[PDB]
Amino acid sequence: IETVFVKNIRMLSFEDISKATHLPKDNVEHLVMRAISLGLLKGSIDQVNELVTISWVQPRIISGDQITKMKDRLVEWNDQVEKLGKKMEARGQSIWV
Amino acid sequence: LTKSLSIAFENGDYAACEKLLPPIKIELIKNNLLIPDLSIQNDIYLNDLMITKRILEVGALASIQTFNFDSFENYFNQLKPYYFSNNHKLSESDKKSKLISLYLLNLLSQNNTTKFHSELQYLDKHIKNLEDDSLLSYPIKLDRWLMEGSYQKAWDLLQSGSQNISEFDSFTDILKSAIRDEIAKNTELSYDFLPLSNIKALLFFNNEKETEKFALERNWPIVNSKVYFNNQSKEKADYEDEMMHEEDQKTNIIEKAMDYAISIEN
């Protein structure tokens, strides 16, 4: 739940998960399944691409470190709209009636 | 003085031509004033024309022989209207037929193919059967083989082209290189890799060490005796994305839809 949340990616190879939790591939598959039953993560599993694509994360307590991570994500989208907005000012100049 | 350029060519000392030519260039203006540059032709003018022409033609060959392509280009341009105006009675030379052969090679060797076809159209009606194609065959047939895409027939005409010397070896040597680069571009699309041996045969070398050196300079790494044509292609492409003009030429989704609404609403 920690690894998906903190990352801006939301697909992880089982290799990364295997190394972290010191589990075999048989047990990553159970662990992922349990998260889904209890409702602590929801998602779907490709054991043919070898990913776990999580699609929802349970909100939890947000501590000092996480706010900084949350914050940066927001600066990127704020700047992205502003850049994008100049072109849309530029184009279709004739009419703004 | 004027006459010295004419006998200097016969010596065979062709740098001596060029170092002699500056006085003759001032004296060539005097020659130009005698003819009206052929806006009327008369028989007084007909003696004079031979004089004006003779100076240009021997400079022209002499320049090619010292590998001064630039100077050659200017000469050819002066000469061309003189053959062009008037019913024949002194509008050709022994030298002309050879001269047109050399100019056609210069365009091919610089790879200005655009001007190679324009020039031949204009040329056609002076060489059709009147000087005919007798020496002119050499850039013409080469051309037929390059259009077809027979880089093979093209290579052979160059290879047999060194037995007969008139002075065409100053542009044959350049055309040998022109072919390799053309082949080199086409084979990137075809495949990613050719073994070292298959490269030598296609791109026309006589040493396996030259083949490898050429590849390094051209931005293909040979690693494990397999060339990677894809390298250069990625790098050229990366460069186009590096410079910016770029957003409008491709056109965004947003940009297409903004253009529709404003066309209407005027």
From Swiss-Prot, chain A:
The keyword Calcium does not apply. Keywords: Proteasome. Disulfide bonds: none annotated. It comes from the Eukaryota. GO terms for cellular component: cytosol; nucleus; proteasome complex; proteasome regulatory particle, lid subcomplex; proteasome storage granule. The keyword Lipid metabolism does not apply. GO terms for molecular function: structural molecule activity. GO terms for biological process: proteasome assembly; proteasome-mediated ubiquitin-dependent protein catabolic process; ubiquitin-dependent protein catabolic process. Acts as a regulatory subunit of the 26S proteasome which is involved in the ATP-dependent degradation of ubiquitinated proteins. Belongs to the proteasome subunit S11 family. Present with 12400 molecules/cell in log phase SD medium. This is 26S proteasome regulatory subunit RPN9.
Swiss-Prot record, chain B:
Signal peptide: none annotated. GO terms for cellular component: nucleus; proteasome complex; proteasome regulatory particle, lid subcomplex; proteasome storage granule. The keyword Heme does not apply. Transmembrane segments: none annotated. InterPro entries: 26S_Psome_Rpn12 (IPR006746), CSN8_PSD8_EIF3K (IPR033464), PCI_dom (IPR000717). Pfam families: CSN8_PSD8_EIF3K (PF10075). Residues 70-245 form the PCI domain. This is 26S proteasome regulatory subunit RPN12. It comes from Saccharomyces cerevisiae (strain ATCC 204508 / S288c).
